[PDB]
């Protein structure tokens, strides 16, 4: 028996588990120490959660150590660790539009986007990894034979041991699943630590663990911050790889802990700043519809969101005028009501942000066509904004916003490689992309860009199957497909001679 | 012209290049600055060789950068790059007696291990490597389709771009090849800093570049201080990616300055402390044969050498008067006689190391059967060292030595799973080996060692083709194999629609 | 509604479609010509079944043809493909004990065999290739760049289109399913072919694809003759791969057909003659154990039986006499009947073969220590036999027998070439094994067989992730695991200059 | 010494073995049969050439078979293979202007094309495959566990064994060096038959193998008949692979040859009636180009040639006028002048059969736009010839030329799927391209092109590491990439209890 916080809500009675999960019970901190979760729709307080010490960073370790060392999960088949994967999915799909309704609560999510993205993905996520597990091979390797000896040589691939996950707030339920889905399929336990403003989901995930019979151990939940919680992750003895997403900050000081400890592994998926180049011979109406989707997708919190727009010289304005036409047809409203496309963004602090890197790009000169501010209601939603003028040395041009602002320079008619030199002047790289109807200009741009994923005539395209990440400072290792795996697996050559 | 130091010797005339390799061609250090290397057989000064200062870091990184962003290198075909590839493997070859004579005067290697070791397995490393070029392929995915459009998602491999390379004394011309080769068949260019102690088959490898047509920039060559070289190069804004060999403090602070310089990539091959299992069903004769040379090959300068031998009981006083027997036949001497099997160490400060650390074994109540001191005769030369009755709290159970000394502990008849948690209970996991002619024992052995590699009825098997690295803190990453690519290669996926 | 045969038996209520499978519903042949189907238990009909003629045949494959070039299977996404094959396996577990029945009455196995192996198998082969759909992939190539131009080439996996798959009656569900699934992973859609005697769980199977939700038309079956359905599939023109396992000569036939009419792809897994080698050094009482599984396994009714063991001449007659031992403790009788572990042969004319080739053993002047005949009882039940003495030129050492049949040779203590030499001296190459402690004897007695699979220290240890096929005349191309992809996918390449 | 038929041409003094060569010596055929090789620039006879009979190729298979079990070719690494395959693309290398000069006579090839072609691509054949021979790898595979037991499965890349090669007269020394290449990097040993019409630079390759150090009977070359030669390779009993590049009839009859003697694996490269699809959005210059060189390259000889073209109405009338001017500047004329673009077809007899495709062209209705007859000039040239108002119910729209005849046919305005039917409603499935700059269009239709190669505004642009083989009744199976590899491999699956 699981204590709940229960809420009526979107026609359901939200069950959510509001403790840390460890070992596979519900339990609170030490010293009963909570915090609360806040609702982004109205500024209400939705519940109390337990807020995660040091002492209780340890136990959840241990039960993440035991469980591989000698739970039952380091010794089942690897295709029985892929069933019970698959069944934590059937699981997931089983309580959708519940895990939407708690992510449109506690980060602002629509409810219908985050039905399709948020928990859609998260359950296509575990399917995708279940199938692997039995499907992760290493091989057999002709070496120089020590004759008149004979030799052979095989690697294995076996598990790192205990990761600990480290994720950020704009997609809550997704970035667990992600990482989670790998790191499990791969045969490792886990520790996760949500965003501290973000817990509910992945609470309400770790219900469903014990539902689908993972073994009490393996996934183990600490809502808590991450200078405390992340930090001791990053340090423990026994946490053999981190796997983290979030600022470029954060992942230098991540890695600098994972060195000091015990040189445990570590991937970074960390900040961008992207460019999307659209040239006047692309499809205009779909430049258009897709423009505005890699900027106001999930209100701009969006690890992949183009950053900047180039947009060649002869349709800039015709551009312009039909993005703001578009702009006004968007129904800002709560994210549970069925009519809504823009929800609030996820939290106060970051709604204030938003404010003031809007200020910053009028003071630096750029023209604002449309949005920049808080919209006058409850809650903290931020209207849909378009810059342009914008040049390359303003702040805006560098710094990434995470929120729904448009960020647009032009180009000369003509110009390849100036704009591509223009996109490429960051210290980012973790996506680009490229409209054109020309197959030349297509091919030679996603080749020149220098960023982890190119999307052509296209965006937002991110799939289950199609390894994610970035270059340069956005990191470094792939969240899914099968590049995924390689991060949490570690190889053993084994050398005969006989 | 190049500068060269000329000698007479092996039957030989060597021609040594003695200062940096910059953009194509050898430069003195900032100020002329210079150091002396010193022959580790008689303690005499070999010649001076430039000393690398931070601009003359910069002046590499530059030329490295340059040679990656526009010369030919990044222009020509990856078979092309692989064709020039195994003409620097060709050139090698026809060099290989002067490259190995320069190993035996710089590193103490004995000439003949030194040209079928040394200089052959870097000659083997780059043809292997070579034929990598064109075969390093990317992936098609069958992603989701947005209906009632379509999508296509590749992914490109593409290198990562300036690369630094750091390595240790211990196989100068070996541990150079073995980074180099994969970093540079992955289409990379690179900054190379060898150990102080032994630059000059780095600077000799350098010529050869130049006389296998590589294009100046690709390759450049620094010797000089990890603390003001390999520094500078793990903190540069340009470089993207250091791959390092070494101890474990040494590798923590190296990707500690990767994270806060620029998030650069890092792959770690660190220290060892590898086990040797024993049991008494193994082919004694053959046992004592490898476990010889798991101990003393290459005067135990080796990271894969086996720190601690288990030896089951009932064969352990046999085992241990056959390794006496043995040792009493070695022949130390000048690595340039063809009768020395056992040569000098590397410098002199390594040999102090290993005098105190066979004190040390002494003091703590280890027994000393044979050795344990600097043999009497000129330069840096020690005993073939066998201790017995070592315990498992004792520091030369923990300690790596890094020379000729055989640590050997008893277990009981019949313990299987008793000497695997002894042999486990480091936080190193280099390399490991097991001797037993049975079948279901090796293979449960095999499993259960958390290292690396694991050897079976052999012991210091490489293989160019068989990926090398540790396990824990002996690091992350591979040398050797297809799996070593992978550290100098990036993915960027590509998604179209249409 | 469908039509059904209704019985009751084992505790359930049997319903049995007992009509052609054609466009996703069952339907008469062709003139309603039925022929019957005969329990092996005592000699009865179990029911009429539906007889396919050409226009039948010509039916099937173009509603297979209609199904992939414009139903919904040619259009859904690989993932979706991979869930509905996820459903399948789903549905036919649901289902266990209802099909494991059909094939007791059926085929004559075992129930708890039936239940563990037949389907069980089966349903681990659907989720397996299920979890294969979104991770076929194909490459992107580094190719010489036509300068000043660039050039991209990446290749594309596509399905073959209609298959038609033609399978025998020792294993009718399991064989059905190992290529069905591949099949259907793969993108395809396919016409099969049961052996005539056992059509009755593959039209069940044919039911449950309708309950999976499985587009009609992707999958149809036809129970009829090999000589008149079996060939129409080989000559057809919109066929375009066949997937085939049964003898060596039918097999050589439906080449030659598949070359005559418009070179279709064909895969052939043929007969076998396996040799299971037991050295004088292996575990005795397991080497009993596992040698009878070898022969005796599903009445000897098994692709990979091992057909001769060689026993070393120390341990052969003691081995014999724990073989006698044995094979007096197992126990005859109805396949339904829970203490049962030899049921009978699959159909009448099989037994007559192997009462035939009992005859011609002792003929030919073998020793037969038991068996050898029909059981004195209703049905087709066969004596467990074993025969020693063989020597090669006999044709019992020659001719596969597909009964349970161990026939048994010696050789000489220490010989380990001239035994190799005795057991690759057949045309066949399918399976093959040996039992030793010796890991050198092991390592080179696996690398010198000439087979496709090699088990050490076991039998019968087939996994759906292990490839399992025949070299020389048992054929060519792969069943089971990723390899088995290969047969049904082509790779198209494609090459932009841009 | 080699028996040499001498000739002083071309600046050179050709040497070119005119006998069989089988086991390491040329030799005579049995009674001292030869034939006569003809000159197809002048008719004349160029020398008489060994005529192989039935127990030569017997001989040949013996001593494959001989090379293959028991000589140094079976026993080497997989490296040191790989070293004598880079040896001999560098003998080939050395000798380039002599095989050039011996192809130009023997088959026709234009001299400065087949320096870069004909010889400059077998030599990046053999250096790609040699290459892969340490490279290619098997699998070790995570199997269900037979608990309280454990399993390791490992799968073995294997040699098939004796391979028999039948090649085509078109590309004498590369079609030789596609397969050959891949088949001697797999292990494997072989005989070759070249085309009657065209054995001497196959018969000069032999003689670079002893250069080369290739062991004597690893690569035995028997000129003589298909019907005879040919026909006693695809039924040996010693024969384990059959690699066959040719017209489709043939391979039909090969394919029914291996299936009735022992099962022999078979890969087929068959006829195409290839399509290229310009639309008007092309860049027509290159379109033009392009077009050109897909029909006209070596003489048409060439079997991706594209054997329609399929122009759009609005661009056809232009194109053809750009094709007539283009055609009417190349020059027709001996191989050996430099400035040749068009050199004589290789043989008399298909000369004949070119003089009748076009007569039957005419006669059903297309107009001849220019040429369709010989060239009045000794020796065997052919007018390069345009054919429009070409329709699809034609005998010249189905059927292969193999000639210098472009076929044109226009399409639509528009029409995207109407002109992709008319390109697929071929049997063959060889190559296709198709030229646009739109990049909706290109990717759509090389998704619906129904053949194993798409061209994208490129075509001729093979690579020998992008895999190369046709669909439907142009055959299966690729040469070039790493996939020619596993026509030449089989995979042995060992398992192991422990
Ligand atoms: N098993 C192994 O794979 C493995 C390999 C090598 C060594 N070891 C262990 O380490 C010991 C060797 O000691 P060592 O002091 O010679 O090795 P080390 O300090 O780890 O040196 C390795 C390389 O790193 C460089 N380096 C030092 N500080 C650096 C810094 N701050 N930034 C960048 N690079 C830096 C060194 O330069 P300098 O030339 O100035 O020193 C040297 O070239 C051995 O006794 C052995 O136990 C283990």
Not at 61 to 66: F, Q
Not at 414 to 428: C, I, K, P, W, Y
Request: glycine content about 8%.
């Amino acid at each position: 028996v699981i204590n709940y916080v229960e809420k009526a809500v979107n026609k359901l009675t939200l069950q959510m588990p509001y403790q840390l999960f460890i070992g596979g019970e519900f339990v609170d901190a030490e010293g009963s120490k909570t915090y609360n979760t806040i609702n982004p729709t109205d500024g209400s307080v939705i519940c109390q959660v337990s807020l995660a010490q040091v002492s209780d960073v340890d136990k959840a370790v241990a039960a993440a150590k035991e469980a591989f060392e000698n739970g039952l999960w380091g010794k089942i088949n690897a295709r029985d660790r892929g069933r019970l994967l698959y069944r934590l999915a059937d699981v997931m799909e089983q309580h959708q539009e519940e895990l939407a309704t708690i992510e449109a609560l506690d980060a602002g999510a629509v409810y219908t986007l985050a039905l399709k993205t948020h928990v859609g993905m998260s359950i296509q996520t575990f399917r995708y990894f279940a199938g692997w597990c039995d499907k992760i091979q290493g091989a057999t390797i002709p070496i120089n034979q020590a004759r008149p000896n004979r030799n052979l040589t095989l690697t294995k691939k076996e598990p790192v041991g205990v990761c600990g996950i480290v994720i950020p707030w704009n997609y809550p339920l997704m970035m667990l699943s992600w990482k989670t889905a790998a790191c499990l399929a791969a045969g490792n336990t886990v520790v996760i630590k949500p965003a501290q403003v973000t817990p509910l989901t992945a609470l309400k995930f770790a219900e469903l663990t014990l539902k689908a019979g993972i073994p009490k151990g393996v996934v183990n939940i600490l809502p808590g911050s991450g200078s405390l919680v992340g930090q001791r992750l990053s340090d423990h003895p026994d946490v053999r790889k981190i796997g983290f997403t979030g600022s470029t900050e954060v992942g230098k000081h991540i890695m600098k802990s994972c060195a000091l400890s015990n040189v445990k592994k570590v991937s970074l998926q960390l900040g961008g700043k992207s460019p999307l180049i659209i040239f006047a011979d692309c499809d205009l109406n779909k430049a258009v519809q897709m423009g505005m989707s890699s900027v106001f997708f999930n209100k701009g919190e969006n690890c992949i969101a183009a950053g900047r727009l180039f947009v060649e010289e002869s349709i800039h304005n015709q551009f312009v005028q039909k993005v703001v036409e578009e702009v006004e047809k968007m129904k800002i409203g709560n994210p549970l009501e069925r009519d809504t496309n823009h929800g609030p963004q996820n939290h106060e602090a970051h709604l204030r942000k938003l404010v003031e890197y809007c200020q910053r790009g009028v003071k630096e000169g750029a023209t604002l066509v449309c949005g920049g501010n808080q919209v006058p209601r409850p809650g903290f939603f931020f209207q849909p904004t378009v810059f342009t003028d914008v040049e390359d040395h303003m702040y805006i041009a560098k710094e990434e916003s995470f929120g729904p602002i448009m960020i647009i320079s032009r180009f000369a008619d003509g110009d390849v490689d100036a704009v591509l030199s223009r996109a490429n002047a960051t210290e980012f790289g973790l996506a680009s992309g490229v409209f054109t109807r020309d197959i030349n200009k297509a091919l030679y741009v996603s080749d020149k860009l220098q960023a982890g994923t190119v999307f052509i005539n296209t965006y937002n395209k991110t799939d289950v199957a199609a390894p994610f990440g970035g270059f340069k400072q956005s990191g470094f290792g792939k969240d899914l497909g099968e590049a995924a795996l390689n991060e949490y697996l570690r190889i053993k050559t084994v050398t005969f001679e006989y």
